[PDB]
Write a protein that binds this ligand. Structure first.
Ligand SMILES: Nc1ncnc2c1ncn2[C@@H]1O[C@H](COP(=O)(O)OP(=O)(O)OP(O)(O)=S)[C@@H](O)[C@H]1O
Ligand SMILES: Nc1ncnc2c1ncn2[C@@H]1O[C@H](COP(=O)(O)OP(=O)(O)OP(O)(O)=S)[C@@H](O)[C@H]1O
Ligand SMILES: Nc1ncnc2c1ncn2[C@@H]1O[C@H](COP(=O)(O)OP(=O)(O)OP(O)(O)=S)[C@@H](O)[C@H]1O
Ligand SMILES: [Mg+2]
Ligand SMILES: [Mg+2]
Ligand SMILES: [Mg+2]
Lengths: 432, 432, 432, 432
DNA sequence: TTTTTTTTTTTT
């Protein structure tokens, strides 16, 4: 029914107002229909009005396509004529036609991706998406229903807004009291929280301590280590949970009986979730890789995480920018934005680590301007905490956590407090 | 390869154990292959054992099909032979075949769903799923593999992680008591270890001493040199091992009797490894060149290294970044990441050296901020030591090895420790 | 004998382990044999084992091949069969076949090289080697035997190392005993030696004196002067060797009989080499230019230098770097690395010059931190020297040398030795 | 080409004496060309003189030739003319022909060697060289050049070098006795010479003066100005040459009659050169635009300069630096290198100006350390005169010339000298 | 040819 759609795009102002915002060039044909719609779209972009038959003929004469295409477009334009119709049958039929064409294009692209990925490398016609984003494309084929959400009205829609304040399902409480106090109830789902410490100051000890604390509070935690292996992170978690020093495990001061007893005692407790550690090579995982990991975890292991942790965003690969194409600023900003998009998609608290510049190392204070790889990371991150350690603090078994970007509350209040990091047990303890 | 799959299902046993749970009748065909697999599955369900060829013939006789296909099935079971193929290739090829067939089935299913949706509701099939199920089932076809483990589970896999604590399987001792003490068992496999010092301060001296100590502990050590050539390194090793000064070699104070006698005395030891010294042009070798070198070392001789000593990573080239496309920071970070990836792939301890800045060449203390080239090298490294030499230290044949970074222990317990350095013998001795 | 080679690759473990590491795809043909070897090589790379017939004709042959290629590969794979042949005749015949194919490929390559170079520019197919490097390709093709020579085994190659020690077949002695007692026999072959003096302090008087000494020692010397003309240097050499003041050759106090006669005196001496002087514009000569000059000298003048003296390292250009960089650190380091690579490739002692920092001007002592252009140059140099004659040594015709970096020995043993400069004769004399 | 070669062997003397030693029978053909050269070689041997074309015909008349050869030889002899080609093109073309024929013969010989090598050992030719001789044979093909001049060969070019010292082939006098005294006969070709303008001491006045003394000595001078127009610079030149004060021209004291009379008086003198003034915008002239200007002047104006004077080094731009700066050190160092490269490649004396440090401005004495361009100009400059002005020197109409860097001669011989600067006529006169 | 981030280096 392409002829009817074009005719009522021309000879119906009411029809054009609703269907146009959604009409696209890939929904008609590879011949006369697409060319006619391209003519109409160019005229609309140039004059912001629906062209007439004379305007279409003039644009057709000032066009460069061949004789066959010219004749087809001329016949199609000559066949366009308004008919007595009703707005509803046309809008519903157009929605059905657009949905069918979107599904057809999506399945054609799916077949193309499958037949392209099944090719020897270096001859796979790059810039074509991989099989990993096969379902997502189909998800885009179903989100076309002529029902775009205009937005949220402050006065018209306030009961629904008020039924989001006492819900509190968005906030995931910590286990430390100070972190809950500064965040006013803990971190929120669909966010990107960051730890900035430097090199060998913490920043993975803190992530492991957070993972252990969330695990004790009945949470499913997905640790993703882009550098350290799976047994080192698991060893850190074991040291945190079992209250056994990493030196004791290395020096064999803990027996198999004690280890088994502690593990079974933790297992028999109802207030304990599941922690899963996954390792990827440095620069070999992205947002799409994490989504594939999420899907295979949900299917194979029936594991649905809420506290997804990534060891370092700077070590991950952007899923949109080719490697080493853009500078550190753009690449890191894109990676952080994609991670935040993943977090809001799966509705999980995302925790990450970030390096500071060389000038901030061995300094008694770390500012937000000391971020290493990009200034956009603080802009695209919900909460950031700076971990500072000096010789005096190290001798006191304490670290100073400074609130650098506090989006859940006022950062001026409680800006710097001293945590009791214990490096042997990979644990954070409070001083209150 | 359905014939191979069926033959190794009937005959091979470990392949049957690994591949049978991930087998469905929809993966094979709609003809003789499907019928044969159905017969095998029925037999294995009746009797919990793999059938034989005579059993297959009996099942065909008692459980019959239409002769049209029955002839094709009986001629299909005439070629299944033992054919002792290797297990890894067979498993990988079967996995690829089942993944391809799953993708084909998912595409056909989504096409059928789309076709059914187009049909009017009066005559549309009821067993077919709705269009909304198209994405998820596609995901069900994306995550199909033979990997029963998707990650590391803290509570599920408490066993097989305690084994890694009893038997280290990662630690490699240092032959020096101070380094073992500050490392708690020595450097670990799949790690990048760095000695940082000023120009001609003794980066090669320390690396040669470590190589000699590893060689005395029955280790395969591969010394790759982008500079310093080859012979020069073997002379340093000879000075360390044969207890002859460098001046003696270049002044002719050692006879061929002493040299050959000491070499054969070392050869008679059963606790001696192999030391291959390889030379590459400065800036003319990368991680892939190292992988090719390892492959040719494994082929042309029975040499698989456990220690890999790269003389200086700064004078290597990245296997991803084009030459001089990026600055020092990005290139050196990429080189360090590639070297660590090589280390984790080969499960070897990779030692290397790095230069310090121009400002630290005449300083009694060297900080992590004094690293030359990238600041991401300390981030990528697993263990970094700073070699400091001053006039007072040189007057006593000693250096000031300082812990810059340590993923093996707390860097503050023994941060700075004096080490006697015999430059004539190119040897590190410990003060006792 | 391609069929026999492939058959015994598939069906012989000993033959495979003997001949596979020396196999290349450029040896068989441009038809079925090359495709079969590609399949075998891909299988061995992927699974580290020799493929079987089933793996070849099922798991691998189902790939992107045309009908003719598919038929040829099928026929060749079906024709493969194990044949009983002695495993001393097979290896020798395979080695002969490989050598013949390498020679054939080299001949075709040099024919293509000549055809390309015969064509006029703008169509000359860059990155293809010039006509000068025809003999090296043929020589490489000649030495294509199946001998395992990967690196320098420490225990297996101590005989050759001792031969190198006793022959001292790396040292090139100086004519000055002071420079021989600190270098333990002079400079080594594959080395980069540097002089740092300042502005109008030396830095070419020293290079000219070293060239004159090497000329008197029978060495072939190549003086590449980027900053000085081909004649300004020669005249300095004449002043050094003829014991005539540099001013006397300008005012005219030396008669032609003296000049020609003194020259004839040197010519009659059999311990005199060639000091060929070649000038390049300042900033217009790289390592590739020097290689072209070496090839031209070898072909035309039959001149193979043992000493290469570049008048100034910092006014050359980098062959690897394509876009000029305002950062002097990277450019000078790249130039030094390329020069040292050239030196180790040609086994020629390479002397050059470096500029000291303005702070070091009129300073009684010059440290290594006074290097001006780059801090990477001292890291790549094998031996550096500093000239620090400020004001009083000039009145006594003296120059003090500090020995800033010494890779031939301990630089703290004889740090200063107060060389006897003579600027009129442009030479160095000892203070014995 | 063979016809031309034989014709100019018969009918020329310089061509014969130049190309006969490099002429062989195998270089021509297997029919007319080779036989005809054989006749020339035969006659050149029995009678040591070039045969007459009739004598060459007499050789054909009296020689063993097959009917076809004898005819072929007669036709070729009748086809030789005494036409006059240019010598350089003839020598170059016959060299190329000889090189191509030698390469073809060597390639055919190595192919024949390889073919003979792949033959039954019992059955092969003994005279054919072994395969190992292939790389040497090609070398003999590449060692064919009518004239070998790769650089300056010491002990092989001493007679030519002496003719350079006596004839002062490189020196260009100054017309000022003091400047000739300190340069041992003037500046040299292929050099960069700069004057260190101090505190508002000067701006082009000196370079304009240098553009008059060279003009009076007969040299072609190209004055490139950036901060001035052509008319203004030529007005400064007129002031110096016509003895008219600079302000007198603007005021109008000098009339057209006197101006034209003085100009024609200068034109009558045969000891006068040509001055070409070219203007470029500030920062819009790198030392690659100057090459284009020289090419245009040579092609169109036939003006090949011996002196090139650039108004100001700082105003110039680097050919390949992209980013320019009003007063940046990196640009000045690059500009100096590019200008000196231009001087070397054009064999011209290049003069320019640069600013100095404020300390050099306040202090009457100027140190190389006290220079705006440090380690950049006193490294690429053969001569650097420090022209500074003092109120006392001003009151006496003088300027103290100090010699800060003299590659030509000893810097301390005559370092300080007083110059009679006239600021009105823009002139330098000597002081008794 | 400019523009902007980050780093590293060096010169004043
Ligand atoms: N095995 C161990 N035993 C004891 N202490 C350890 C051990 N590993 C690490 N530490 C301590 O933990 C501190 C911080 O460890 P990490 O969390 O790995 O630092 P980091 O910031 O994550 O390292 P990078 O540079 O970001 S990869 C170190 O400085 C050590 O003091
Ligand atoms: N060939 C040698 N003969 C004698 N002593 C040497 C020799 N090479 C090095 N040394 C001594 O050992 C010290 C360190 O040398 P290396 O370990 O080779 O240098 P490095 O720290 O690797 O730095 P580079 O690579 O030379 S910039 C020197 O400063 C000397 O004291
Ligand atoms: N013709 C000469 N007569 C006498 N002494 C000279 C002569 N040329 C140079 N010198 C002296 O030689 C030294 C100059 O060093 P050179 O060997 O020319 O190299 P350089 O000048 O230091 O290099 P740069 O980059 O040009 S500063 C000074 O001590 C001069 O006095
Ligand atoms: Mg970390
Ligand atoms: Mg080194
Ligand atoms: Mg010089």
């Amino acid at each position: 029914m392409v002829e009817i759609i074009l005719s009522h795009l021309i000879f119906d102002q009411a029809y054009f107002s609703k269907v146009w915002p959604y009409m696209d060039s890939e929904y008609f044909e590879s011949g006369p229909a697409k060319n006619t719609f391209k003519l109409i779209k160019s005229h609309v972009n140039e004059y912001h009005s629906v062209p007439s038959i004379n305007a279409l003929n003039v644009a057709l004469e000032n066009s460069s396509f061949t004789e066959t295409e010219y004749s087809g477009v001329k016949t199609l334009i000559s066949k366009l004529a308004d008919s007595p119709e009703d707005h509803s049958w046309l809008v519903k039929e157009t929605e059905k036609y657009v949905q069918q064409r979107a599904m057809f294009n999506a399945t054609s692209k799916i077949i193309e991706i499958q037949t392209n990925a099944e090719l020897p490398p270096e001859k796979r016609n790059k810039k074509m998406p991989d099989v990993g984003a096969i379902p997502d494309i189909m998800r885009q084929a179903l989100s076309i229903s002529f029902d775009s959400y205009v937005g949220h009205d402050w006065m018209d829609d306030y009961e629904a807004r008020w039924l989001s304040y006492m819900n509190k399902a968005r906030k995931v409480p910590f286990k430390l009291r100070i972190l809950n106090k500064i965040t006013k109830g803990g971190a929120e789902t669909g966010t990107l929280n960051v730890l900035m410490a430097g090199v060998n100051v913490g920043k993975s000890l803190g992530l492991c301590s957070l993972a252990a604390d969330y695990l004790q509070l009945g949470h499913n935690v997905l640790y993703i280590s882009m550098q350290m292996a799976e047994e080192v992170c698991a060893k850190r978690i074991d040291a945190n949970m079992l209250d056994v020093s990493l030196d004791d495990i290395d020096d064999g001061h803990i027996s198999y009986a004690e280890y088994k007893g502690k593990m079974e005692k933790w297992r028999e407790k109802s207030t304990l979730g599941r922690l899963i550690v996954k390792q990827y090579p440095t620069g070999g995982a992205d947002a799409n890789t994490f989504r594939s990991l999420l899907n295979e975890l949900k299917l194979k292991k029936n594991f649905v995480p809420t506290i997804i942790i990534v060891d370092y965003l700077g070590i991950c690969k952007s899923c949109r920018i080719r490697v080493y194409s853009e500078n550190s600023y753009t690449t890191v900003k894109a990676i952080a934005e994609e991670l935040r998009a993943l977090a809001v998609e799966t509705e999980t608290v995302l925790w990450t680590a970030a390096q500071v510049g060389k000038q901030a190392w061995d300094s008694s204070d770390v500012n937000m301007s000391d971020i290493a790889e990009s200034a956009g990371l603080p802009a695209t991150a919900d909460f950031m905490l700076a971990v500072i350690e000096t010789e005096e603090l190290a001798a006191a078994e304490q670290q100073l956590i400074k609130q650098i970007k506090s989006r859940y509350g006022d950062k001026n209040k409680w800006n710097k407090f001293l945590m009791g990091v214990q490096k042997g047990n990979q644990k954070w303890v409070e001083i209150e």
